[PDB]
Amino acid sequence: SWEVGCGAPVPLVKCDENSPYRTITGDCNNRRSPALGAANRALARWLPAEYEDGLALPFGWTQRKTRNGFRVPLAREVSNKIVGYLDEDGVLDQNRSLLFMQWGQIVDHDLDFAPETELGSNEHSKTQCEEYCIQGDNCFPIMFPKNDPKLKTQGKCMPFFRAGFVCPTPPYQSLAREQINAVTSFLDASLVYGSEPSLASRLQNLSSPLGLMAVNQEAWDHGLAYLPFNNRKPSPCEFINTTARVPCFLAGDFRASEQILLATAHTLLLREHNRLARELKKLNPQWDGEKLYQEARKILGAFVQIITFRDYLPIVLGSEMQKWIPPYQGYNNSVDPRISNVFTFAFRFGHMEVPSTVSRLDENYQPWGPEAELPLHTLFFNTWRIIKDGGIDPLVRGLLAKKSKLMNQDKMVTSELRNKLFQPTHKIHGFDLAAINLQRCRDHGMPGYNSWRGFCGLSQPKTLKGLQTVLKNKILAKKLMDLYKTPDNIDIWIGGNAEPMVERGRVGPLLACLLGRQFQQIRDGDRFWWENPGVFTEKQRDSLQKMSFSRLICDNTHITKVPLHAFQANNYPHDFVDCSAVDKLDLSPWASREN
Ligand code: HEM
Ligand SMILES: *[C@@H]1O[C@H](CO)[C@@H](O[C@@H]2O[C@H](CO)[C@@H](O[C@H]3O[C@H](CO)[C@@H](O)[C@H](O)[C@@H]3O)[C@H](O)[C@H]2NC(C)=O)[C@H](O)[C@H]1NC(C)=O
Ligand SMILES: *[C@@H]1O[C@H](CO)[C@@H](O[C@@H]2O[C@H](CO)[C@@H](O[C@H]3O[C@H](CO)[C@@H](O)[C@H](O)[C@@H]3O)[C@H](O)[C@H]2NC(C)=O)[C@H](O)[C@H]1NC(C)=O
Ligand SMILES: *[C@@H]1O[C@H](CO)[C@@H](O[C@@H]2O[C@H](CO)[C@@H](O)[C@H](O)[C@H]2NC(C)=O)[C@H](O)[C@H]1NC(C)=O
Ligand SMILES: *[C@@H]1O[C@H](CO)[C@@H](O[C@@H]2O[C@H](CO)[C@@H](O)[C@H](O)[C@H]2NC(C)=O)[C@H](O)[C@H]1NC(C)=O
Ligand SMILES: O=C(NO)c1ccccc1O
Ligand SMILES: [Ca+2]
């Protein structure tokens, strides 16, 4: 008895069987268990959920119920005390480009999305929550502590709505509350193509048999494409500058316009698909609209996989890479490919990697204009700066020439995210990503820090002094202990990120284990992994290994001067070579001799 059945409210169809292409929803990857890894199903639970009432209510909800004998500290107070800092000087990662951060967010968005609860196409709930901070039903407000500046100017709380959950919607019961993953668990470029058949089609250009994705018709970038605008009104990207009135972009994933540099990455990817389809039609004139689409799509998925596993992961995991992701040995049908609930919090390490400004660079990589460098907070949901202020190139050069923020125990998340975050629903630039992440841990029913330490076979400190040794920091450990009273209560997000970094990596031991495990699984459990014998031909594989993020830029923008290794810190002009010197993807193994 597993309650095993609930496969209700989720989209279902029938398995093409022997079809050489992924489904849009991720169904039919695993043959014996077709829904494994599919969009719109519960996040997997590596450990049982820990809720206040065993079942659904998050810790902190009832002001008199403790966690292990103690009150859990307010999310925003953990924010003020531990996460914040004032001095941006000295914070840059000396050996990671701004693209390091940016790629993490692309990968993250391909793997997981736990959307908020609605129950309001119009309702006094999406206003009884913001207006009066009344806790109730899915309103779980972030209360301001005594002495928080935002009291004086903003109000009593920050509104926060609980994440969606499987089986039904309305008030629910029985089992413990399981959050939804609205995206496919496979590294499959679902952020470009969509996770629903509904959206996947909208995204496509079905006016012509060329297998192209829809492109914006109102605006161009030197004869290069943009993403289509979104139908949706109200539009937050419009609300950001009512004079300019530029809507958000329409991509395979809904978060695409969250910040300008993410919209930039999205548009590079769309551009690549269309390029692939054209080139492909040249070699194979007989091919379908659909065949063009799927074949370009499959190449792109292979790209996202290769860069992620070859270029990106080795420099997050560092020396722990070998211990968690051993060399590939083939598809294993017994490996569970689903994204775990804790992964969506472990992968939030990238929040501590966001710097406070974004730069635009000209063709010599010099400050583009008099306002080249901008505070990150003016760029949330900002599309007008792309369309009406130089297009994509000045913004991509910044990604190569500037650095990520480095995680630092005394300087965690920049005030740009910690004080001035803009939420697409509400109206001010006054939210706090750090406090939200913490509130969300509780919302998702996360075991505490020592549960995960235990899970990863690592020591579980019980005392101040134990915590000082693990964190290798007396002061940090003291603050944590004063807010939390015992390490068993430390929220996973703040606990995992407070750990010193492993050698040659950018996360600590606990994070390396959680991430490493997840990635091993999503590679080993993927029937369509690129190296899986029979998915691509040997000659096709040889062609795919030559792919690089540098090339992507050469083929898709008017940048002519790029680094070879784009994720490490690169200085212009020494570290920058001409595009000619950069290996090209050879599409000739994709030829199809008729007779
Ligand atoms: C300026 C850059 C970024 C902004 C503004 C941003 C903003 C946000 C916001 C508002 C959320 C939702 C919080 C919640 O409701 O719980 C979120 C979630 C998340 N973020 Fe970030 N983020 C950024 C960069 C990154 C980076 C660099 C990474 C990783 C390298 C990352 C990983 C994640 C992940 C994994 C989630 C959970 C998504 C889910 O499963 O629902 N983000 N981010
Ligand atoms: C800045 O970061 C660089 C990013 O990797 C780093 O250089 C790299 O160092 C690692 C080992 O420390 C090596 O990487 C690779 O190792 C072998 C080559 O012997 C390959 O077979 C592996 O697949 C893997 O890619 C490289 O030697 C080197 N990687 C690159 C891309 O050049 C620098 O050391 C960092 N700078 C400093 C001083 O911290
Ligand atoms: C809202 O978005 C507006 C862009 O649609 C933006 O206004 C634009 O920005 C500057 C003025 O600050 C102008 O840029 C330059 O234009 C000419 C060159 O042709 C110069 O002579 C000007 O002096 C100026 O430097 C844009 O022309 C201007 N466009 C319009 C129609 O106003 C606003 O800054 C945005 N506001 C916010 C709050 O972000
Ligand atoms: C769908 O694809 C078609 C075919 O490329 C696009 O229409 C072309 O647009 C360019 C620029 O205007 C012109 O060469 C022609 O007007 C069209 N070509 C042909 C073959 O007629 C169209 O823009 C795409 N539709 C969308 C919404 O992206
Ligand atoms: C595929 O991965 C599965 C899941 O981890 C492996 O299942 C294991 O089977 C081995 C023996 O082959 C046992 O030693 C492990 O204890 C099993 N794991 C669990 C917890 O079930 C399996 O090793 C892999 N299959 C192959 C043949 O590579
Ligand atoms: O940018 C985001 N994540 O990185 C994001 C933005 C809005 C809503 C949910 C999200 O996950
Ligand atoms: Ca996916």
Coordinates of C-alpha atoms in Angstrom, one line a residue, residues 53-568:
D53 CA 1.0 19.4 11.6
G54 CA 2.7 16.5 9.9
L55 CA 0.7 17.0 6.8
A56 CA 0.8 20.5 5.1
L57 CA 1.2 23.4 7.5
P58 CA 4.7 24.9 7.3
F59 CA 6.9 25.5 10.3
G60 CA 6.4 29.1 11.6
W61 CA 2.7 29.1 10.6
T62 CA 1.3 28.6 14.1
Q63 CA 3.1 31.2 16.4
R64 CA 3.0 28.8 19.4
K65 CA 4.1 25.5 17.9
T66 CA 7.9 25.0 18.0
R67 CA 10.3 23.1 15.8
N68 CA 12.3 20.8 18.1
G69 CA 11.4 23.0 21.2
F70 CA 12.2 26.3 19.5
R71 CA 10.5 29.1 17.5
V72 CA 11.8 29.2 14.0
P73 CA 13.2 32.7 13.4
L74 CA 11.4 35.1 11.0
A75 CA 12.6 34.7 7.4
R76 CA 13.3 38.4 7.0
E77 CA 15.3 38.6 10.3
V78 CA 17.6 35.7 9.1
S79 CA 17.9 37.9 6.0
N80 CA 18.8 41.2 7.9
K81 CA 21.2 39.4 10.3
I82 CA 23.1 37.0 8.0
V83 CA 22.5 37.6 4.3
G84 CA 22.8 41.4 3.9
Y85 CA 25.8 43.6 3.4
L86 CA 26.6 47.2 2.2
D87 CA 30.0 47.2 0.5
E88 CA 30.0 45.9 -3.1
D89 CA 33.8 46.5 -3.4
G90 CA 35.9 43.3 -3.3
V91 CA 33.0 40.9 -4.1
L92 CA 33.7 39.8 -7.7
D93 CA 34.7 36.3 -8.5
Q94 CA 38.2 36.6 -9.8
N95 CA 37.9 33.4 -12.0
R96 CA 34.3 33.2 -13.2
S97 CA 32.6 35.3 -15.9
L98 CA 29.1 36.8 -15.5
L99 CA 28.0 33.9 -17.9
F100 CA 28.9 31.4 -15.1
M101 CA 25.9 32.8 -13.1
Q102 CA 23.8 33.2 -16.2
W103 CA 24.1 29.6 -17.4
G104 CA 23.2 28.2 -13.9
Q105 CA 19.8 30.0 -14.2
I106 CA 19.2 28.6 -17.7
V107 CA 19.9 25.0 -16.5
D108 CA 17.8 25.6 -13.4
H109 CA 14.8 26.8 -15.4
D110 CA 15.1 23.7 -17.7
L111 CA 14.8 21.4 -14.7
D112 CA 12.3 22.8 -12.2
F113 CA 9.4 25.3 -11.6
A114 CA 7.1 25.2 -8.6
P115 CA 4.5 27.9 -9.5
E116 CA 2.4 29.8 -7.0
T117 CA -1.2 29.0 -6.1
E118 CA -3.8 31.2 -7.8
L119 CA -7.5 30.8 -6.8
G120 CA -8.0 34.3 -8.2
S121 CA -8.7 35.3 -11.8
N122 CA -10.1 38.1 -9.6
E123 CA -10.4 37.8 -5.8
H124 CA -10.1 39.7 -2.6
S125 CA -7.4 37.1 -1.6
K126 CA -4.7 38.5 -3.9
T127 CA -5.3 41.7 -2.0
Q128 CA -6.4 40.6 1.5
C129 CA -2.8 39.1 1.6
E130 CA -0.9 42.2 0.4
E131 CA -3.2 44.8 2.1
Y132 CA -3.6 43.4 5.7
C133 CA -1.0 40.6 6.0
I134 CA -3.6 38.2 7.3
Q135 CA -2.3 34.7 7.3
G136 CA -4.7 32.3 6.0
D137 CA -5.3 29.6 3.4
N138 CA -2.5 30.1 0.9
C139 CA -1.4 33.6 2.1
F140 CA 1.7 33.0 4.1
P141 CA 3.1 36.5 4.7
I142 CA 6.7 37.5 5.4
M143 CA 6.4 39.6 8.6
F144 CA 8.9 42.4 9.2
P145 CA 10.9 42.2 12.5
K146 CA 11.2 45.0 15.0
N147 CA 13.8 47.6 13.7
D148 CA 13.4 46.7 10.0
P149 CA 13.7 49.8 7.8
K150 CA 11.0 48.5 5.5
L151 CA 8.4 48.9 8.3
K152 CA 8.7 52.6 8.1
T153 CA 8.1 52.8 4.3
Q154 CA 6.5 49.6 3.0
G155 CA 4.1 48.3 5.6
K156 CA 3.7 45.3 7.9
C157 CA 4.8 42.4 5.6
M158 CA 5.8 41.2 2.3
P159 CA 3.1 39.2 0.5
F160 CA 3.9 35.5 -0.2
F161 CA 1.6 32.8 -1.6
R162 CA 2.2 29.1 -1.1
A163 CA 3.4 26.8 -4.0
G164 CA 1.0 24.7 -6.1
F165 CA 0.4 21.1 -5.1
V166 CA -0.4 17.8 -6.8
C167 CA -3.6 15.8 -7.1
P168 CA -6.3 18.6 -7.0
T169 CA -6.1 22.3 -5.9
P170 CA -8.7 23.7 -3.4
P171 CA -8.3 23.0 0.4
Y172 CA -6.7 19.6 0.6
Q173 CA -5.8 16.9 2.9
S174 CA -5.0 13.1 3.2
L175 CA -1.2 12.7 2.4
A176 CA 1.4 15.1 3.0
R177 CA 1.4 18.2 0.7
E178 CA 3.5 17.6 -2.5
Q179 CA 4.6 20.6 -4.7
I180 CA 4.4 20.5 -8.4
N181 CA 7.1 20.6 -11.0
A182 CA 5.5 22.4 -14.0
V183 CA 8.6 21.6 -16.2
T184 CA 10.3 18.4 -17.5
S185 CA 13.0 16.9 -15.3
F186 CA 15.2 16.1 -18.3
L187 CA 17.9 18.5 -19.5
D188 CA 16.0 18.9 -22.8
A189 CA 15.8 22.6 -23.6
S190 CA 12.2 22.7 -22.3
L191 CA 12.8 26.3 -21.6
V192 CA 13.1 27.0 -25.3
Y193 CA 10.3 24.7 -26.6
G194 CA 7.8 24.7 -23.8
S195 CA 6.6 21.8 -21.5
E196 CA 3.0 21.7 -22.7
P197 CA 1.7 20.8 -26.1
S198 CA -0.5 23.9 -25.9
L199 CA 2.5 26.3 -25.5
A200 CA 4.9 24.3 -27.7
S201 CA 2.6 24.9 -30.7
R202 CA 2.1 28.6 -30.1
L203 CA 5.9 29.0 -30.0
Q204 CA 6.2 27.4 -33.5
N205 CA 6.0 29.1 -36.9
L206 CA 3.4 27.0 -38.7
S207 CA 2.8 29.5 -41.5
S208 CA 5.7 27.9 -43.4
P209 CA 7.1 24.4 -43.7
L210 CA 10.6 25.4 -42.5
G211 CA 10.4 24.2 -38.9
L212 CA 11.1 27.6 -37.5
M213 CA 10.1 29.1 -34.2
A214 CA 8.0 32.2 -34.2
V215 CA 9.9 35.5 -34.1
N216 CA 8.9 39.0 -33.2
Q217 CA 7.4 40.9 -36.1
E218 CA 7.4 44.4 -34.6
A219 CA 11.2 44.7 -33.9
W220 CA 14.5 43.5 -35.2
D221 CA 18.2 43.4 -34.0
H222 CA 20.2 44.3 -37.0
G223 CA 18.3 41.8 -39.1
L224 CA 18.7 39.2 -36.4
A225 CA 15.6 37.9 -34.5
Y226 CA 14.0 38.7 -31.2
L227 CA 11.5 36.5 -29.2
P228 CA 7.8 37.2 -29.9
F229 CA 6.0 39.6 -27.5
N230 CA 3.5 38.2 -25.1
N231 CA -0.3 38.6 -25.6
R232 CA -0.7 38.9 -21.8
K233 CA -2.2 42.1 -20.4
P234 CA -1.6 43.3 -17.8
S235 CA 2.1 43.1 -18.6
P236 CA 4.8 43.7 -15.9
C237 CA 7.4 44.6 -18.5
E238 CA 5.0 47.3 -19.7
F239 CA 4.4 48.5 -16.1
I240 CA 8.1 49.1 -15.7
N241 CA 8.2 52.0 -18.1
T242 CA 4.7 53.0 -19.1
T243 CA 6.1 55.5 -21.6
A244 CA 8.0 52.8 -23.5
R245 CA 5.3 50.1 -23.3
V246 CA 7.3 47.1 -24.2
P247 CA 5.7 43.7 -23.2
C248 CA 7.6 40.7 -21.9
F249 CA 8.9 38.1 -24.3
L250 CA 7.1 34.8 -25.0
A251 CA 9.4 31.8 -24.5
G252 CA 9.1 28.1 -23.7
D253 CA 9.4 29.1 -20.0
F254 CA 7.4 31.7 -18.2
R255 CA 10.3 33.2 -16.2
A256 CA 12.2 34.4 -19.3
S257 CA 11.8 38.1 -18.8
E258 CA 12.7 38.1 -15.0
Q259 CA 15.9 40.0 -15.8
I260 CA 17.4 41.4 -19.0
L261 CA 20.4 39.0 -19.1
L262 CA 18.1 36.0 -18.9
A263 CA 16.0 37.3 -21.8
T264 CA 19.3 37.7 -23.6
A265 CA 20.2 34.0 -23.2
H266 CA 16.7 33.0 -24.3
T267 CA 17.1 35.0 -27.5
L268 CA 20.5 33.5 -28.3
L269 CA 18.8 30.0 -28.0
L270 CA 15.8 30.8 -30.2
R271 CA 18.2 32.2 -32.8
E272 CA 20.2 28.9 -32.7
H273 CA 17.2 26.8 -33.4
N274 CA 16.2 28.8 -36.5
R275 CA 19.8 28.8 -37.7
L276 CA 19.9 25.0 -37.3
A277 CA 16.6 24.5 -39.2
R278 CA 17.7 26.7 -42.1
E279 CA 21.1 25.0 -42.4
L280 CA 19.3 21.6 -42.1
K281 CA 16.8 22.4 -44.9
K282 CA 19.8 23.2 -47.1
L283 CA 21.4 19.7 -46.6
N284 CA 18.0 17.9 -46.7
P285 CA 15.6 19.7 -49.0
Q286 CA 13.0 16.9 -48.8
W287 CA 12.6 17.2 -45.0
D288 CA 9.3 18.1 -43.2
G289 CA 8.3 21.2 -41.2
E290 CA 8.1 18.8 -38.3
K291 CA 11.3 16.9 -39.2
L292 CA 13.1 20.2 -39.4
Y293 CA 11.7 21.2 -36.0
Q294 CA 12.4 18.0 -34.1
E295 CA 15.9 17.6 -35.6
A296 CA 17.0 21.1 -34.7
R297 CA 15.3 20.6 -31.3
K298 CA 17.2 17.4 -30.6
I299 CA 20.5 19.1 -31.6
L300 CA 19.8 22.0 -29.1
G301 CA 19.0 19.7 -26.3
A302 CA 22.3 18.0 -27.0
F303 CA 24.0 21.4 -26.8
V304 CA 22.5 22.4 -23.4
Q305 CA 23.5 18.9 -22.1
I306 CA 27.1 19.2 -23.4
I307 CA 27.9 22.7 -22.1
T308 CA 26.3 21.8 -18.8
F309 CA 28.1 18.5 -18.2
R310 CA 31.4 19.3 -20.0
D311 CA 31.9 23.1 -19.2
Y312 CA 29.7 24.1 -16.3
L313 CA 29.4 21.3 -13.7
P314 CA 33.1 20.6 -13.3
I315 CA 33.6 24.2 -12.0
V316 CA 30.6 24.1 -9.6
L317 CA 31.4 20.8 -8.1
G318 CA 35.2 21.1 -8.3
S319 CA 37.0 18.1 -6.9
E320 CA 33.7 16.5 -5.7
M321 CA 32.7 16.1 -9.4
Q322 CA 34.4 12.7 -9.7
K323 CA 32.9 11.4 -6.4
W324 CA 29.2 12.1 -7.5
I325 CA 29.2 12.1 -11.3
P326 CA 31.4 9.2 -12.5
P327 CA 32.0 8.8 -16.3
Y328 CA 28.9 7.8 -18.2
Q329 CA 28.3 4.0 -18.6
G330 CA 24.9 4.0 -20.5
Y331 CA 21.2 4.5 -19.9
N332 CA 20.0 2.9 -16.7
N333 CA 16.2 2.3 -16.7
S334 CA 16.1 1.8 -12.9
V335 CA 17.5 5.3 -12.1
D336 CA 14.8 7.8 -11.1
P337 CA 15.2 10.9 -13.2
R338 CA 12.7 13.1 -11.3
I339 CA 13.9 16.4 -9.8
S340 CA 13.7 16.2 -6.0
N341 CA 12.1 18.9 -3.9
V342 CA 15.4 19.8 -2.1
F343 CA 17.2 20.2 -5.4
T344 CA 15.1 23.3 -6.2
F345 CA 16.5 24.8 -3.0
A346 CA 20.1 23.6 -3.4
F347 CA 20.2 25.0 -6.9
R348 CA 19.5 28.5 -5.4
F349 CA 23.2 28.9 -4.6
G350 CA 23.3 30.9 -7.7
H351 CA 21.5 33.7 -5.9
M352 CA 24.7 34.5 -4.0
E353 CA 26.4 34.8 -7.4
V354 CA 24.5 37.7 -8.7
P355 CA 26.5 41.0 -8.8
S356 CA 24.8 44.4 -8.3
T357 CA 25.2 46.0 -11.8
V358 CA 24.9 45.0 -15.5
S359 CA 27.2 46.5 -18.2
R360 CA 26.8 47.2 -21.8
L361 CA 29.9 47.1 -24.0
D362 CA 30.7 48.5 -27.4
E363 CA 32.7 46.8 -30.2
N364 CA 36.1 47.4 -28.5
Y365 CA 34.5 46.2 -25.2
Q366 CA 34.5 49.8 -23.9
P367 CA 31.6 51.2 -21.9
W368 CA 28.7 51.6 -24.3
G369 CA 27.4 55.1 -23.9
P370 CA 27.3 57.3 -20.8
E371 CA 25.0 54.9 -18.9
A372 CA 26.7 51.7 -19.8
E373 CA 26.5 50.2 -16.2
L374 CA 23.1 49.9 -14.5
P375 CA 21.8 48.7 -11.0
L376 CA 20.4 45.2 -11.4
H377 CA 17.1 46.3 -9.8
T378 CA 16.2 48.5 -12.8
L379 CA 16.4 45.4 -15.0
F380 CA 13.9 43.1 -13.5
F381 CA 11.2 42.5 -16.2
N382 CA 12.9 45.1 -18.3
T383 CA 12.6 44.4 -22.1
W384 CA 12.6 48.0 -23.2
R385 CA 16.4 48.2 -22.7
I386 CA 16.9 45.5 -25.3
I387 CA 14.5 46.6 -28.0
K388 CA 15.1 50.3 -27.6
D389 CA 18.8 50.6 -26.4
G390 CA 21.2 48.6 -28.6
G391 CA 19.8 45.0 -28.9
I392 CA 21.6 41.9 -27.7
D393 CA 25.3 42.4 -28.6
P394 CA 26.3 45.1 -26.0
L395 CA 24.6 42.9 -23.4
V396 CA 26.4 39.6 -24.4
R397 CA 29.8 41.3 -24.4
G398 CA 29.2 42.1 -20.7
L399 CA 28.5 38.4 -20.0
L400 CA 32.0 37.5 -21.4
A401 CA 34.0 40.5 -20.0
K402 CA 32.5 41.0 -16.5
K403 CA 32.6 38.6 -13.5
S404 CA 30.1 36.7 -11.3
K405 CA 29.8 37.7 -7.7
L406 CA 31.7 35.3 -5.5
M407 CA 29.9 33.6 -2.6
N408 CA 31.3 35.1 0.6
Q409 CA 30.3 34.3 4.2
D410 CA 30.1 38.0 5.1
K411 CA 28.5 39.1 1.9
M412 CA 25.9 36.7 0.7
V413 CA 23.1 38.3 -1.5
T414 CA 23.4 41.8 -2.9
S415 CA 20.8 44.4 -1.8
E416 CA 19.6 44.6 -5.4
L417 CA 17.9 41.2 -4.8
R418 CA 17.6 41.4 -1.0
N419 CA 15.8 44.8 -0.8
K420 CA 14.7 45.8 -4.3
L421 CA 13.3 42.7 -6.0
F422 CA 10.3 43.3 -8.2
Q423 CA 7.6 40.6 -8.2
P424 CA 5.5 40.4 -11.5
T425 CA 2.2 40.5 -9.6
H426 CA 2.8 43.3 -7.1
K427 CA 4.0 46.8 -7.8
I428 CA 7.1 47.9 -5.8
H429 CA 10.8 47.2 -6.2
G430 CA 10.8 46.2 -2.6
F431 CA 10.9 42.4 -2.2
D432 CA 13.6 40.2 -0.7
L433 CA 14.8 37.1 -2.5
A434 CA 16.7 35.7 0.5
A435 CA 13.7 35.9 2.9
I436 CA 11.5 34.4 0.2
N437 CA 13.8 31.5 -0.4
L438 CA 13.7 30.8 3.3
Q439 CA 9.9 31.1 3.5
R440 CA 9.8 28.8 0.5
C441 CA 11.9 26.1 2.3
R442 CA 9.3 26.1 5.0
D443 CA 6.4 26.1 2.4
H444 CA 7.9 23.0 0.7
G445 CA 8.2 21.2 4.1
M446 CA 12.0 20.8 4.0
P447 CA 13.9 18.7 6.5
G448 CA 16.5 20.8 8.4
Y449 CA 20.2 21.1 7.9
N450 CA 21.4 18.1 10.0
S451 CA 18.9 15.8 8.2
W452 CA 20.7 16.6 4.9
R453 CA 24.1 16.5 6.5
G454 CA 23.1 13.0 7.7
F455 CA 21.7 12.1 4.2
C456 CA 25.1 13.0 2.6
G457 CA 27.1 11.0 5.2
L458 CA 28.6 14.1 6.7
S459 CA 29.0 15.1 10.4
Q460 CA 26.0 16.6 12.2
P461 CA 27.1 19.4 14.6
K462 CA 24.9 19.8 17.7
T463 CA 26.8 22.6 19.5
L464 CA 28.1 26.1 18.8
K465 CA 31.6 24.8 18.6
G466 CA 30.6 21.9 16.2
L467 CA 29.0 24.4 13.9
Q468 CA 32.1 26.7 14.1
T469 CA 34.3 23.8 12.8
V470 CA 31.9 22.8 10.0
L471 CA 31.5 26.5 8.8
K472 CA 35.1 27.3 9.7
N473 CA 33.7 30.7 10.9
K474 CA 33.1 31.7 14.6
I475 CA 31.0 34.7 13.9
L476 CA 28.6 33.3 11.3
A477 CA 28.1 30.2 13.5
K478 CA 27.2 32.4 16.4
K479 CA 24.6 34.5 14.5
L480 CA 23.0 31.3 13.1
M481 CA 22.9 29.8 16.7
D482 CA 21.3 32.9 18.2
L483 CA 18.6 32.9 15.5
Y484 CA 17.9 29.2 15.4
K485 CA 18.9 27.8 18.9
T486 CA 20.0 24.4 17.5
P487 CA 21.5 23.5 14.0
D488 CA 18.7 20.9 13.5
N489 CA 16.5 23.8 12.8
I490 CA 18.8 25.6 10.2
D491 CA 16.9 26.0 7.0
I492 CA 18.6 24.0 4.2
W493 CA 19.0 27.1 1.9
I494 CA 21.0 29.1 4.4
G495 CA 22.7 26.1 5.9
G496 CA 23.9 24.7 2.5
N497 CA 25.2 28.1 1.4
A498 CA 27.0 29.0 4.6
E499 CA 29.5 26.2 4.1
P500 CA 33.0 27.0 2.8
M501 CA 33.6 26.0 -0.8
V502 CA 35.2 22.7 -1.9
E503 CA 38.5 22.9 -3.7
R504 CA 38.2 24.3 -7.3
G505 CA 34.4 24.5 -6.8
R506 CA 31.8 27.1 -6.0
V507 CA 29.6 25.2 -3.4
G508 CA 30.4 23.4 -0.2
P509 CA 30.2 19.6 0.7
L510 CA 26.5 19.4 1.5
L511 CA 25.6 21.3 -1.7
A512 CA 28.0 19.2 -3.9
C513 CA 26.3 16.0 -2.7
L514 CA 22.7 17.3 -3.3
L515 CA 23.5 18.8 -6.7
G516 CA 25.9 16.0 -7.7
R517 CA 23.4 13.3 -6.9
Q518 CA 20.6 15.0 -8.9
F519 CA 22.7 15.5 -12.0
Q520 CA 24.0 11.9 -12.0
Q521 CA 20.4 10.8 -11.9
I522 CA 19.1 13.1 -14.6
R523 CA 21.9 11.9 -16.9
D524 CA 21.7 8.2 -16.1
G525 CA 17.9 8.1 -16.2
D526 CA 17.6 9.8 -19.6
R527 CA 16.8 7.5 -22.5
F528 CA 17.7 10.5 -24.7
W529 CA 21.0 11.4 -23.2
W530 CA 23.3 12.5 -26.1
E531 CA 26.0 9.8 -25.5
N532 CA 23.3 7.1 -25.1
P533 CA 24.2 4.6 -27.9
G534 CA 21.7 4.9 -30.8
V535 CA 20.4 8.4 -30.0
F536 CA 23.0 10.1 -32.3
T537 CA 25.3 8.3 -34.7
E538 CA 29.0 8.1 -33.9
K539 CA 29.7 10.7 -36.6
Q540 CA 27.0 12.9 -35.2
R541 CA 28.6 12.6 -31.8
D542 CA 32.0 13.6 -33.1
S543 CA 30.4 16.7 -34.5
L544 CA 28.6 17.6 -31.2
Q545 CA 31.8 17.6 -29.1
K546 CA 33.1 20.5 -31.0
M547 CA 30.2 22.7 -29.7
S548 CA 31.1 25.6 -27.4
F549 CA 29.3 28.6 -26.0
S550 CA 31.8 30.8 -27.8
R551 CA 30.7 29.4 -31.2
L552 CA 27.0 30.0 -30.3
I553 CA 27.8 33.7 -29.9
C554 CA 29.8 33.8 -33.2
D555 CA 26.9 32.2 -35.2
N556 CA 24.1 34.3 -33.5
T557 CA 25.3 37.8 -32.9
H558 CA 27.6 40.3 -34.6
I559 CA 30.4 39.7 -32.0
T560 CA 33.6 38.8 -33.9
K561 CA 36.0 38.5 -31.0
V562 CA 35.3 35.9 -28.2
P563 CA 37.2 33.9 -25.5
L564 CA 37.7 30.2 -26.0
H565 CA 36.8 29.2 -22.5
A566 CA 33.8 31.5 -21.8
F567 CA 33.0 30.5 -18.2
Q568 CA 36.4 31.5 -16.7

